[PDB]
Amino acid sequence: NKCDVVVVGGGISGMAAAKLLHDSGLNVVVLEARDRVGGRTYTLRNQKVKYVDLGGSYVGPTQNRILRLAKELGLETYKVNEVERLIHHVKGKSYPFRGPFPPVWNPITYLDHNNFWRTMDDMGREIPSDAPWKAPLAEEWDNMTMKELLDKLCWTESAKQLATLFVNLCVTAETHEVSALWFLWYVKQCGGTTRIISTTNGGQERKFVGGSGQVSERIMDLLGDRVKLERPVIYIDQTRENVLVETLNHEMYEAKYVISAIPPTLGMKIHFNPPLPMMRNQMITRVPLGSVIKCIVYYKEPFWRKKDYCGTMIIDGEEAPVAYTLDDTKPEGNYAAIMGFILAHKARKLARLTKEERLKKLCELYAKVLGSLEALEPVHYEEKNWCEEQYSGGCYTTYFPPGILTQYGRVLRQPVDRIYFAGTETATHWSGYMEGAVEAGERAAREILHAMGKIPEDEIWQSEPESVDVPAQPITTTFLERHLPSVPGLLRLI
Amino acid sequence: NKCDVVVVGGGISGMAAAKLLHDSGLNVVVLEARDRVGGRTYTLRNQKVKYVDLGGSYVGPTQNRILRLAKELGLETYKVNEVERLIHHVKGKSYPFRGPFPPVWNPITYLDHNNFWRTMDDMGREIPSDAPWKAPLAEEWDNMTMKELLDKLCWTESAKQLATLFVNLCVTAETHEVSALWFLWYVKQCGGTTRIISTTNGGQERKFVGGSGQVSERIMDLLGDRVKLERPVIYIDQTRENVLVETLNHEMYEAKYVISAIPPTLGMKIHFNPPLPMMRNQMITRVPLGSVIKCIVYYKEPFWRKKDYCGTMIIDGEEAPVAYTLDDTKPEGNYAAIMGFILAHKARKLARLTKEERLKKLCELYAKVLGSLEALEPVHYEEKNWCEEQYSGGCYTTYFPPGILTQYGRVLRQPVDRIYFAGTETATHWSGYMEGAVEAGERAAREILHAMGKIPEDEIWQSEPESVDVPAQPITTTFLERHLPSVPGLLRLIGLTTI
Numbered sequence: 007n008k009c010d011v012v013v014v015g016g017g018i019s020g021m022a023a024a025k026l027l028h029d030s031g032l033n034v035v036v037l038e039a040r041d042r043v044g045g046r047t048y049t050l051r052n053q054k055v056k057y058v059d060l061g062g063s064y065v066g067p068t069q070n071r072i073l074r075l076a077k078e079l080g081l082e083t084y085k086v087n088e089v090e091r092l093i094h095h096v097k098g099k100s101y102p103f104r105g106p107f108p109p110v111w112n113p114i115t116y117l118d119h120n121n122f123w124r125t126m127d128d129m130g131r132e133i134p135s136d137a138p139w140k141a142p143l144a145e146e147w148d149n150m151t152m153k154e155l156l157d158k159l160c161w162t163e164s165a166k167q168l169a170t171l172f173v174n175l176c177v178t179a180e181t182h183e184v185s186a187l188w189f190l191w192y193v194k195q196c197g198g199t200t201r202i203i204s205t206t207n208g209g210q211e212r213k214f215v216g217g218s219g220q221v222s223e224r225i226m227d228l229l230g231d232r233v234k235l236e237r238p239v240i241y242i243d244q245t246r247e248n249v250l251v252e253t254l255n256h257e258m259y260e261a262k263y264v265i266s267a268i269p270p271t272l273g274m275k276i277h278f279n280p281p282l283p284m285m286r287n288q289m290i291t292r293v294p295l296g297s298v299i300k301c302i303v304y305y306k307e308p309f310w311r312k313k314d315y316c317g318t319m320i321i322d323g324e325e326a327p328v329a330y331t332l333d334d335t336k337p338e339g340n341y342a343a344i345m346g347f348i349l350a351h352k353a354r355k356l357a358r359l360t361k362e363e364r365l366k367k368l369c370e371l372y373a374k375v376l377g378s379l380e381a382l383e384p385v386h387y388e389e390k391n392w393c394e395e396q397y398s399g400g401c402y403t404t405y406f407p408p409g410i411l412t413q414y415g416r417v418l419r420q421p422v423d424r425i426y427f428a429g430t431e432t433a434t435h436w437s438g439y440m441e442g443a444v445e446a447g448e449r450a451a452r453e454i455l456h457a458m459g460k461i462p463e464d465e466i467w468q469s470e471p472e473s474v475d476v477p478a479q480p481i482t483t484t485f486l487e488r489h490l491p492s493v494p495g496l497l498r499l500i
Numbered sequence: 501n502k503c504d505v506v507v508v509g510g511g512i513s514g515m516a517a518a519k520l521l522h523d524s525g526l527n528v529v530v531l532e533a534r535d536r537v538g539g540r541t542y543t544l545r546n547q548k549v550k551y552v553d554l555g556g557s558y559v560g561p562t563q564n565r566i567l568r569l570a571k572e573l574g575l576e577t578y579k580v581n582e583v584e585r586l587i588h589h590v591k592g593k594s595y596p597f598r599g600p601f602p603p604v605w606n607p608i609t610y611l612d613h614n615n616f617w618r619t620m621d622d623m624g625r626e627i628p629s630d631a632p633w634k635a636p637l638a639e640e641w642d643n644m645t646m647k648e649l650l651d652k653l654c655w656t657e658s659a660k661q662l663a664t665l666f667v668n669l670c671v672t673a674e675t676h677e678v679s680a681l682w683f684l685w686y687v688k689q690c691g692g693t694t695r696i697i698s699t700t701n702g703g704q705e706r707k708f709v710g711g712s713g714q715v716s717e718r719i720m721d722l723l724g725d726r727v728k729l730e731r732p733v734i735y736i737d738q739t740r741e742n743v744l745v746e747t748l749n750h751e752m753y754e755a756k757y758v759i760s761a762i763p764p765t766l767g768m769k770i771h772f773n774p775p776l777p778m779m780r781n782q783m784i785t786r787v788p789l790g791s792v793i794k795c796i797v798y799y800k801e802p803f804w805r806k807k808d809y810c811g812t813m814i815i816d817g818e819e820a821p822v823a824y825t826l827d828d829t830k831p832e833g834n835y836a837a838i839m840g841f842i843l844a845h846k847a848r849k850l851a852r853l854t855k856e857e858r859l860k861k862l863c864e865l866y867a868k869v870l871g872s873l874e875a876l877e878p879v880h881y882e883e884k885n886w887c888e889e890q891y892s893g894g895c896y897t898t899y900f901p902p903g904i905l906t907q908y909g910r911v912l913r914q915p916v917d918r919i920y921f922a923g924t925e926t927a928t929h930w931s932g933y934m935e936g937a938v939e940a941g942e943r944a945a946r947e948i949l950h951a952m953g954k955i956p957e958d959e960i961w962q963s964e965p966e967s968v969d970v971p972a973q974p975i976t977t978t979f980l981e982r983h984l985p986s987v988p989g990l991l992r993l994i995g996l997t998t999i
């Protein structure tokens with residue numbers, strides 16, 4: 007029944023908010039729709055895999071909040087294998103390489119690739135992390151898809167194919183589905199292209215020993231009986247002195263304040279009294295999540311390492327079910343595995359198959375790309391299609407179709423009376439990630455502390471000390487990278 | 501508690517489904533979220549206006565199902581005033597005209613305008629009404645916005661400006677928001693550009709005497725206590741023998757079958773057990789409704805008619821709050837009024853103002869467009885912002901952003917076990933309209949009758965006899981319209997003789 011704050015949603019963001027409020031001495035209740043916490047993180051345990059992250063998994067330098075929270079909970083990280091060579095597979099052939107970016111030899115193609123990445127970052131510098139709709143060319147960029155941008159920018163099919171894969175991998179959506187403004191903001195707020203795509207020194211550097219699901223589980227342990235599982239919220243009534251929150255099983259909860267820590271569009275599952283203001287009412291019908299199947303194929307050994315391949319594959323083309331893989335082998339060197347993402351329209355297309363059929367397709371792809379018959383002899387398989395999840399809507403995160411961010415973006419984290427908005431979608435740094443989940447949860451919790459007169463306005467947004475365990479190397483460019491001309495620039499010079 | 505079919509939603513589609521089922525001898529219940537039926541139709545009555553439609557209103561030739569349903573309920577139509585001249589207001593000046601299309605004098609601009617409309621219809625012919633995703637270039641067209649299509653097609657700012665206004669008016673959304681495939685389908689399934697934009701001989705030809713909301717009200721009267729108001733559905737459980745439907749006030753309903761007659765995205769407000777299949781799960785988060793404020797300004801007399809203006813204004817330009825108006829005077833000639841739409845981004849922008857501030861802006865616009873100081877002397881004002889409606893989501897209808905119709909379109913009316921899908925969005929002829937609501941409601945009811953073994957598969961989709969009261973003139977083109985070149989075609993012809 008009665009408490010200080012009801013938190014709707016027990017993913018990382020809701021759990022982080024609840025923990026903060028609880029630690030401050032308030033009485034909190036977390037209402038969670040599922041029979042588990044973790045949300046878009048989910049760690050499966052069985053004897054075959056020991057543990058595997060079927061949802062959110064990777065953390066890296068500059069993600070200091072998730073690192074701090076996890077460390078406090080007694081968790082440790084290990085490094086994703088990137089010792090040996092990466093592979094770029096293009097037009098049916100594998101090209102091994104080192105460093106974050108797949109190399110390019112054709113000079114014209116080199117100029118075009120260089121200019122594409124550079125231009126993404128140039129554009130991003132004009133986009134405020136906390137208010138992308140304030141970009142000088144906000145409307146122009148918002149009224150275009152990433153597909154139109156790429157069509158204008160890329161003078162080679164090669165650069166355009168890699169740019170397209172980059173978009174599909176980053177936001178699990180097609181270039182024609184997403185706003186140019188939103189995508190450029192998305193990249194910028196993760197620290198730029200190099201940081202977002204990198205394993206070593208970027209977002210995919212590390213995983214948690216034992217799985218990321220332990221973050222939400224261990225907070226649930228701390229909160230004890232304050233977490234209510236299988237309590238989908240159906241109704242929020244703000245017409246009276248105390249906020250009334252009702253669940254599907256008819257339980258009633260009364261609080262001074264509410265934190266909505268669910269994906270924005272999942273706000274649609276709640277009936278509001280009084281109705282939401284017009285802008286939020288429409289916003290929450292305009293913001294879908296992307297489409298992905300996360301697939302993990304297990305092998306007797308990490309055989310790719312013997313051929314001086316780390317297990318990272320960047321795989322061009324329509325025929326490939328999976329466009330990106332990483333080595334998912336345990337730090338001990340056992341439970342050898344390849345993690346792959348089936349992205350965007352392929353998730354939709356390949357979902358029609360059976361589990362066994364998808365396994366076979368992945369193994370045949372990997373055998374080709376790795377040039378290894380050993381890829382054809384899997385010992386186990388796990389996968390999760392996030393498109394089927396009623397209480398997620400997709401993965402990894404919410405994307406903004408053209409026109410939406412400029413028109414509706416400002417209401418995303420705008421409080422509605424006594425409802426404050428957490429969830430990774432509301433973060434300003436690594437929004438879309440576990441890191442942004444923590445930022446948003448703790449910020450929403452502190453907005454409530456301030457509303458209660460407990461802290462100054464000054465302390466709502468709080469900086470994070472850099473992790474000593476995962477230090478960040480700065481992102482550098484070369485003189486030639488900075489100053490080499492684009493394709494049209496070379497033509498203007500001619 | 502127990503019945504044959506629960507219908508979720510008491511708008512025209514749900515009411516049409518419920519009526520058909522009831523007439524066939526089944527026990528039906530309608531569960532309606534609001535304290536009223538009608539949904540996206542709403543007829544306000546007070547002494548100042550007598551009655552006024554604040555939501556859906558116009559019907560016209562080829563909309564035979566809504567016409568038949570309304571006639572059977574004892575309703576009559578009247579013709580929207582189009583006796584005098586229409587006005588096209590462009591770059592601060594008004595140009596009166598007759599006929600559906602605003603005329604163009606510059607022969608280059610003339611070629612461009614002609615080619616634009618022609619091309620919309622050309623492309624539409626390639627799109628099946630019942631399966632737009634089967635169009636030969638479906639993916640190509642779906643992966644483009646209407647803005648990109650317009651940028652490629654229109655060689656003049658003049659054609660591009662009018663085309664933009666046409667999209668905004670038709671689907672209450674910006675050109676950059678909507679799929680080109682979806683918009684081309686949407687126009688084609690209303691019978692094409694001429695039919696959709698026309699008053700005389702098109703969609704805006706007529707209104708119902710007394711308001712469109714009488715359609716839903718009169719069906720409610722027929723069904724009696726079977727319509728439950730203020731019963732928003734929160735939960736549908738299909739795990740057992742009978743389907744279980746729960747409302748917000750905790751009432752339980754058990755049925756053999758369910759019809760969902762709500763806007764597709766509003767399916768999100770229901771928790772499903774078992775969960776929806778993956779495609780529908782994601783589809784319902786991908787399909788927003790448009791943005792509109794419908795505004796009616798009342799005057800002492802229909803003074804525009806004295807100046808040989810019928811009251812239709814097509815008003816281009818960012819500064820104009822309202823891009824389209826029609827005369828909304830009663831057929832008796834009293835309660836003189838102008839209806840105008842505030843569309844898409846302007847609905848969002850101008851919603852920040854007060855009602856009094858919006859009235860002032862509209863009057864000042866109308867005075868300018870009509871060249872009439874009388875427009876500054878309104879006697880009354882009514883308006884409705886459909887963006888604020890929890891149980892509509894917007895108006896007039898659902899639009900599809902780029903990429904969505906080809907990926908998700910096929911599940912829109914695909915049954916989910918014992919749930920069948922009605923609502924205007926699922927129609928194949930005049931989807932988006934009251935007409936499409938009737939088609940979809942009755943088709944969904946018959947899908948259930950067929951499932952029950954009561955009718956053959958053959959009878960699920962049923963043709964409609966043409967109205968005798970509202971006959972449809974065919975859509976014609978001229979020889980020149982058909983064969984005049986586009987701008988680039990003229991240029992190709994020039995480059996050819998220069999060799």
Ligand SMILES: *Cc1cc2c(cc1C)nc1c(=O)[nH]c(=O)nc-1n2C[C@H](O)[C@H](O)[C@H](O)COP(=O)(O)OP(=O)(O)OC[C@H]1O[C@@H](n2cnc3c(N)ncnc32)[C@H](O)[C@@H]1O
Pocket residue numbers: 014015016017018019020037038039040042043044045046047060061062063064065237238239240267268269272275276298299300392397398400401402403428429430431438439440441443
């Ligand atoms: C799915 C996924 C995500 C992911 C990714 C790969 C996949 C396949 N890889 C990631 C990675 O490597 N590194 C990273 O940092 N992030 C990665 N992502 C995304 C990441 O998992 C998410 O950003 C993060 O988990 C989001 O957290 P948040 O707390 O903001 O949101 P959530 O996990 O969805 O939690 C919401 C909870 O709310 C419950 N819910 C939903 N509706 C209700 C109602 N009505 N009532 C009560 N509770 C509700 C959900 O069940 C959920 O638990």
Ligand SMILES: *Cc1cc2c(cc1C)nc1c(=O)[nH]c(=O)nc-1n2C[C@H](O)[C@H](O)[C@H](O)COP(=O)(O)OP(=O)(O)OC[C@H]1O[C@@H](n2cnc3c(N)ncnc32)[C@H](O)[C@@H]1O
Pocket residue numbers: 508509510511512513514531532533534536537538539540541554555556557558559731732733734761762763766769770792793794886891892894895896897922923924925932933934935937
């Ligand atoms: C808003 C609008 C619409 C409109 C238009 C102008 C405006 C401003 N002009 C039109 C016109 O001139 N001619 C025409 O034919 N159509 C026009 N439109 C669109 C038209 O009104 C709609 O196409 C039509 O009314 C749609 O009917 P349909 O039956 O398909 O859908 P609905 O009216 O939205 O009814 C849905 C009902 O469901 C209830 N609801 C919603 N959620 C729930 C839940 N969870 N549980 C129970 N009931 C629910 C809604 O309250 C509604 O009554």
Ligand SMILES: NCc1ccc([N+](=O)[O-])cc1
Pocket residue numbers: 064175176202203204210402
């Ligand atoms: N959520 C996992 C993930 C996200 C982004 C990239 N990337 O390369 O941009 C790789 C992997």
Ligand SMILES: NCc1ccc([N+](=O)[O-])cc1
Pocket residue numbers: 558669670696697698704896
């Ligand atoms: N829903 C009203 C309406 C719809 C479409 C048009 N049009 O011109 O295409 C006019 C008015």
